[PDB]
From a paper:
The structures of 2-iodomelatonin- and ramelteon-bound MT1-Gi complexes were determined with global resolutions of 3.1 and 3.3 Å, respectively. The majority of the side chains of MT1 and Gi protein residues are well defined in the structures. In addition to the protein part, an extra density located between the N-terminal portion of TM1 and TM7 was modeled as a cholesterol molecule. The 2-iodomelatonin-bound MT1-Gi complex shares a nearly identical overall structure with that of ramelteon-bound MT1-Gi, with root-mean-square deviation (RMSD) values of 1 Å for the Cα atoms of the whole complexes and 0.8 Å for the Cα atoms of MT1 alone. The binding pose of the ramelteon in active MT1 or MT2 is superimposable with those in inactive structures. Specifically, the aromatic residue Y1875.38 in MT1 rotates from the solvent-facing conformation in the inactive structure toward TM4 and forms a hydrogen bond with N1624.60 in the active structure. This hydrogen bond further reduces the diameter of the ligand entrance and could restrict the release of the bound agonist, as the Y1875.38A mutation led to a fast ligand dissociation rate. MT1 has a tyrosine at the position of 7.40 (Y2827.40), while the corresponding residue in MT2 is a leucine (L2957.40). Packing of Y2827.40 against TM1 pushes the two adjacent residues Y2817.39 and Y2857.43 closer to the core of the pocket than the equivalent residues Y2947.39 and Y2987.43 in MT2. While our manuscript is in submission, Okamoto et al. report the structure of ramelteon-MT1-Gi with varied conformations of H5.46, N4.60, and Y5.38 42. However, an inspection of their data revealed that the quality of their density map was poor and that the model was incorrectly built, especially in the regions of TM5, TM6, and ICL2 and for the residues of H5.46, N4.60, and Y5.38.
Melatonin receptors (MTs) are family A G protein-coupled receptors (GPCRs) expressed in the central nervous system (CNS) and peripheral tissues and are targets for melatonin, the major neurohormone involved in circadian rhythm and sleep regulation. In humans, the MT family consists of two highly conserved members, termed MT1 and MT2, and they share 55% and 70% sequence similarity for the overall region and the transmembrane part, respectively. In this study, we determined the cryo-EM structures of active melatonin receptors engaged with the heterotrimeric Gi protein. The interactions between MT1, MT2, and Gi are mainly mediated by the α5 helix of the Gαi subunit, and the receptor cores comprise TM3 and TM5-7 from MT1 and MT2.
Numbering used by the authors:
A (entry chain F): 2 to 120, 136 to 247
B (entry chain E): 9 to 61
C (entry chain B): 23 to 223, 230 to 313
D (entry chain D): 3 to 340
E (entry chain C): 4 to 55, 182 to 233, 241 to 354
Write the structure that this text describes.
Amino acid sequence: VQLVESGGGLVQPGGSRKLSCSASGFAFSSFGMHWVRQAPEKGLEWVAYISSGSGTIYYADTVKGRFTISRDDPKNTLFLQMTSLRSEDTAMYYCVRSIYYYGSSPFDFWGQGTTLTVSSDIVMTQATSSVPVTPGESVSISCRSSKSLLHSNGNTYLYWFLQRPGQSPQLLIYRMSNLASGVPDRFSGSGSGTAFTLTISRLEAEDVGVYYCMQHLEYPLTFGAGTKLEL
Amino acid sequence: IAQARKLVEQLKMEANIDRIKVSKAAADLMAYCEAHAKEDPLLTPVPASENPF
Amino acid sequence: PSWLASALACVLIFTIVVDILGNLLVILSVYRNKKLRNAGNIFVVSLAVADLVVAIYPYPLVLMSIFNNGWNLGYLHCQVSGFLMGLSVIGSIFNITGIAINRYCYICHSLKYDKLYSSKNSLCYVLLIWLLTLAAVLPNLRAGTLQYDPRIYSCTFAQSVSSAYTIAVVVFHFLVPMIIVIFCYLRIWILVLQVRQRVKPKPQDFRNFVTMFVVFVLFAICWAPLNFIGLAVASDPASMVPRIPEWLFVASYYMAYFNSCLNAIIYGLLNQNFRKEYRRIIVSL
Amino acid sequence: ELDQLRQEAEQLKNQIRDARKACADATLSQITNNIDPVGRIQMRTRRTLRGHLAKIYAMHWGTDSRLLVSASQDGKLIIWDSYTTNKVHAIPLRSSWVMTCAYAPSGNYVACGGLDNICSIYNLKTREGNVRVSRELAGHTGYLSCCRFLDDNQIVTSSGDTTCALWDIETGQQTTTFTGHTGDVMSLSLAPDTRLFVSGACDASAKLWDVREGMCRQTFTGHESDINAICFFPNGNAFATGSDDATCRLFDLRADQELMTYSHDNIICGITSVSFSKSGRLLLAGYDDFNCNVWDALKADRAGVLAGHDNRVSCLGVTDDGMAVATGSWDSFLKIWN
Amino acid sequence: TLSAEDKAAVERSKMIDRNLREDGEKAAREVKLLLLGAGESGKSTIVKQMKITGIVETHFTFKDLHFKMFDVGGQRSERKKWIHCFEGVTAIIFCVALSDYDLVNRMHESMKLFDSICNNKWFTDTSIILFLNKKDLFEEKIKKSPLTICYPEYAGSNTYEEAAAYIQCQFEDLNKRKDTKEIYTHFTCATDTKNVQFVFDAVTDVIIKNNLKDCGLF
Ligand SMILES: CC(C)CCC[C@@H](C)[C@H]1CC[C@H]2[C@@H]3CC=C4C[C@@H](O)CC[C@]4(C)[C@H]3CC[C@]12C
Ligand SMILES: CCC(=O)NCC[C@@H]1CCc2ccc3c(c21)CCO3
């Protein structure tokens, strides 16, 4: 799979810019696309979502109306038209693919991200914003939600992401229990409603970074502040 | 001549295998049916609380 | 005459019972069998509902009126029944037409049928048909042409009040929905005959006409007499109404009433898809 | 010469029958005549999976007892979500003539085959998102009857060439070929430990094979018509057998003889599919009477009738949880009864 | 109520159960056929004419019809146990060798096979397209050898036209459900397109009758 996006750069406030993403190596027509920005120093933030077949489209309240998203199935290309860009719109716009069915793993693969520089809801809070760690240790990151995330059907909508330094986020655990494909079995998620833990066993190099917790119970999608790890 | 030999060999080699009494087999089947009867949602109508359909 | 009233009452009771029977069986047939939920069978359902809508409220009212020899009800109770008779007598005839174009399509322009008559297209076509029926029935309230006729004992469409509206009703409840049906079924029969003759190179050939064309054009026979009487009384309402005997008038109004169940019979029992499964309905119900 | 060998085979069969008679002392009805009847069981349909546009021929549950795969002649096999009646996947087929389907115990693969002589393998857990054909297992010269997964790397298939064959998914070549049937194999059931399997053919015989070496252990005879369905007892020491004689028969692996026959004077049509319950107390048989009959597997009494289908019930399966049974018929409908 | 993912799941399961509708519509519009007959009865020649391992599927578009075709004789197994798979086929193309009436007799096996096929429970309403093959060699074969050897209960002229007409009449009465199904018999016209044209005409007749029965106009 390969998600690469382009079209970023400098722009004057209130202008218009057209972000595009080139998707290859997978059935783009079946996957639902997301746009997730990340401020230069803040955490990640959901933007918009388009479903398979362009049926249902959702937007974040901060970008509703001003931002419109469209997809090009036969050319395997995703667009995000932006109108009236504001100062707070400067961020790292990632492109995320998500397939929704029974047993699927949404938000599995993430793009690179375009550099854009401009010159009611469930709120997530992470208890600790920085945990020093050492090789061979086992830490448990804690994340809390305003509302209990355990739905009636029994699926608790939590997602754990990992931000490598200067790289793209990777899904680790979806729905708090299920490990993503390609992720080592060291990680382990558990908890209950509004109380979530991520247990890392025998953590090693290429594992330090910032960890985000996601809710998919309802739109808009919100992330935690981000627990940052250092050696 | 090969087919008849193969059939004879197969019948001979499958003839000499251990048999149990039919009554013992019936008792074993009844014991299995009685032991696992409590965990059979088809036999006894499960209450709607535990019925996923 | 007592014999006249008795025969008219017998005609109405027969019509009511057979119409209710047929309409109920055909609606629950489509409700039961998934194979019968074809996009082409929606029009048959619409025709059944249209025929049934007077099989309950208005027909018993006029039956009691004959049994009472007088309008023993209210004014509003009269224009609410005339309105429903109008809806039935226009919706049934429009749904017969809709079925006509539907079948021409299946059996002729079959290559472009899947998209032209899809489920969404058929579901918006039946609603369009019903909207046309409602828009045709509605204007008589402002014209005040709905009133109780003592001769036939019904709050029916008065053919003498409005001339222009009568001739418009004539033109779109009998010249068009007859020409369309004639064209559709004649074309289907001709196409079948051509397909048969393209391969190999008589009593069954005639039988066929009898069971497609003649059977499905039976509706245009029942309304023809009173729908010509309407034109006659629209030509000169002052003098033509005394010039037409009440014999023809009543004989027509009961033929037109009988056609309301004739339609449910020819599109009901006369369909092998429903006929074969009718006996399953009786055992199940 | 060969006459001597034929006489030796005849006397071996005679002494085998004599040994089977000697071990026969009391039938299952005599042992269980003191048990209480299960009573009139009423099982009402809870879900109806629609979307197939042709007479279906196969269905198989997943090990999670929520996802089931069904195959029909419209060239499509669909994996359904039983709880919500959702079609998670729809995999087109190269050949629309499909007569069997399988769901891998891990759930990553499905198999299908038919008149095309190929038991195709499809990959579900693919990073590209779509379902791809992993391997096409060809070279079995006959219409396939029942593909069944052993693991994610092995599969057992039965064809109309009177031979069953254990394959290897990654190599594409059959590890073992089971021979001995003189009629077209039409059914196959795997033991719970995946160590043995039994198949039924037109010879009115069910042969108990062994996966390890391939020799046929026991041959069960007593039917008077071809065999259309086979299913083990949950204990794994017994298996039922459905045929065209309108008689389901329960066989014993250890006693090596027929145990009880399930017959009713009313039913005279064949049996297309059989199964069992979690406890094995009752077994469900799908007839051509357009209905499924629930037989008390310990008293040969018709416990109830699952009459909800308008055509012949091709196949039916019971979940691993034992919570529900899903039956499929030629009217292109799946009914989950409970 | 439904969650955010369950709504997307049902949207997926509604687009999947939307492409299936178009797939089924395409499958219904196209025409399916069967090939049956004795060994070396002329299946290969008709297949190669109309074209220009268990199932030899054949596709050929003619006059805007996909014309799916199945040659099943490749695989040898219980015919009665997969013949219900082909129920609902538009028509059965049956190939008969006219000149094979004397070799071992094969016309008796051909007529037995035709009787077995036409009287199946599944093939009740399915019309049968009948082809009579190798008539050219048949003419000289009956010029040299008498026809009475194949048909002892026969008395008539040994000319081509009369013999062919009698064979057609004899084969056309095997079916008992004469009212429901109709047999379209044809003599192959060497290397002309007339064979494919006749197949198209017969399948058009079957489709028209099936559509009439579906509408209830029958
Ligand atoms: C099959 C189609 C033509 C319908 C056939 C039924 C019609 C034509 C028949 C059946 C019963 C008949 C009616 C029976 C009684 C009367 C009363 C009197 O006023 C004479 C005419 C009238 C009103 C008859 C008119 C013709 C009639 C309505
Ligand atoms: C000349 C008209 C005619 O002969 N027959 C149509 C009269 C029918 C029968 C009863 C009724 C009630 C309302 C209405 C209509 C009718 C037509 C338009 O609105």
